[PDB]
């Protein structure tokens, strides 16, 4: 996260760290959506152009964390993966269209003060909140600037951007499964996700029922916090039918 700040304790209790077993290192962010399902970006697990294709046994998920590098004894919980599910039409060949993946845990994680699932939006909550100028929140342990790394979880609030502005900032073909967020150059404020934040959540707090909903997944950007560029996020509601089908079938 660029131009963010330290998260408060328990501020993002759905935050999940995707962690590689060997060598031990951060791989991506992710989020807890139930006691046994974790949501992340497809590109965190699969990108054949770079020979990236992680299997379940390569990875762990670390839940309830605050510190990036410390093993947070008696606070975080580490889970193994039962199964990875990538969206079948994840477009790794072109523009990361449908950049989403689910991970089923081998065992349910115990909820706590530091471990708690986020909501997924219904159609009404999506239509009400996913509007240009409305602000969501991005969290992660990724880079502090274009690359350095944070000591603890970082947080930044960012406005959703009008779809034509998003499209006019890039040569990449933007689909309805993506939205973009970030400040414009003339707005003065700054902030962005960056390398290492991939797969983490973009959330919004409903003003109707005071619950947090995950509207986006950190997907890609051209650089980090560059003027005239914006962060792009997977449109979670647009793919929720796939999410429901996976969890219902499995």
């Amino acid at each position: 996260i660029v131009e963010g700040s330290d998260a408060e304790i328990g501020m993002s209790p759905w935050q999940v760290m995707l962690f590689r077993k060997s060598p031990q290192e951060l791989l991506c962010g992710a989020s807890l959506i139930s006691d046994r399902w974790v949501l992340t970006a497809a590109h965190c697990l699969l990108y054949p152009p770079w020979d990236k294709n992680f299997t379940e046994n390569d990875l762990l998920v670390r839940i309830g964390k605050h510190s990036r590098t410390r093993y947070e004894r008696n606070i975080e919980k580490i889970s193994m993966l039962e199964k990875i599910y990538i969206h079948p039409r994840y477009n790794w060949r072109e523009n990361l269209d449908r950049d989403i993946a689910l991970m089923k845990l081998k065992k349910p994680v115990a909820f706590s003060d530091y471990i708690h699932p986020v909501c997924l939006p219904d159609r009404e909550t999506a239509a009400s909140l996913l509007q240009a100028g409305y602000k969501g929140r991005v969290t992660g342990w990724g880079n502090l600037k274009e690359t350095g790394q944070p000591s603890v979880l970082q947080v930044v609030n960012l406005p959703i951007v009008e779809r034509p502005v998003c499209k006019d900032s890039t040569r990449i073909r933007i689909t309805d499964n993506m939205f973009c967020a970030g400040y414009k150059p003339d707005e003065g404020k700054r902030g962005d996700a960056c390398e290492g934040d991939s797969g983490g959540p973009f959330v919004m707090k409903s003003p109707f029922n005071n619950r947090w909903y995950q509207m986006g997944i950190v997907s890609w950007g051209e650089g980090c916090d560059r003027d005239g560029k914006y962060g792009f996020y997977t449109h979670v509601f647009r793919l929720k039918k796939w999410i429901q089908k996976v969890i219902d079938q499995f």
Partner: peptide, 11 residues
């Protein structure tokens, strides 16, 4: 620069 995690989770 990551602190080692308990061996339980790597077996």
């Amino acid at each position: 620069d990551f602190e080692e995690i308990p061996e339980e989770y790597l077996q």
